[PDB]
Amino acid sequence: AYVITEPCIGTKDASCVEVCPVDCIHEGEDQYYIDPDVCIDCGACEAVCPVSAIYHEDFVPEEWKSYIQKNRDFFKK
Template identity: 75%
Template sequence: MAYVIAEPCVGTKDSACVKVCPVDCIYEGEDQYYINPDECIDCGACEPECPVSAIFSSDSVPEQWASYTQKNVDFFG
């Protein structure tokens, strides 16, 4: 998995990240956006566009939001 969207997105759901994604791999869920790990090309374009700093590379998700990695997997599972 290249990128994970964590808790700061919940309730905010600003679509700036969606607009810059060159492969359209970001999907809207009920409470947040999710990045499809099979479609993401690991370009990183979405990360700086997130106004609430909710996007992290999968190996740098802060510990307090580690559960969002599994939440992302479950969304596409």
């Protein structure tokens, strides 16, 4: 699953949203978040996002594995 990181915070829009086949980009506090478990591991938003602020959950640094859990939590239970 492809997930937000730090750099989109405050940047807030650009934007990714509309490109996603399964539209699973949803707003949070400031920036958007993504449902990674709905997201089908695709490369569309990755390419469009400035400097790919959208990073894959694995690649996402441990520091920001927190945010990835957050993006989950947002649409989890």
